[PDB]
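Before a colleague's protein record goes any further, I have to sign it off. What it holds is a sequence and that sequence's fold in token form. Would you go through it and say whether the fold makes sense for this chain? The record follows directly below this note.
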Amino acid sequence: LLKKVLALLKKVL
């Protein structure tokens, strides 16, 4: 699941 990468995007998004 691309949640590992997505969840880390909340640092900039």
Notes: The first helix runs from residue 3 to 7. Residues 3 and 9 are 9 Å apart (CA to CA). DSSP finds one helix and no strands in the chain. The radius of gyration is 7 Å.
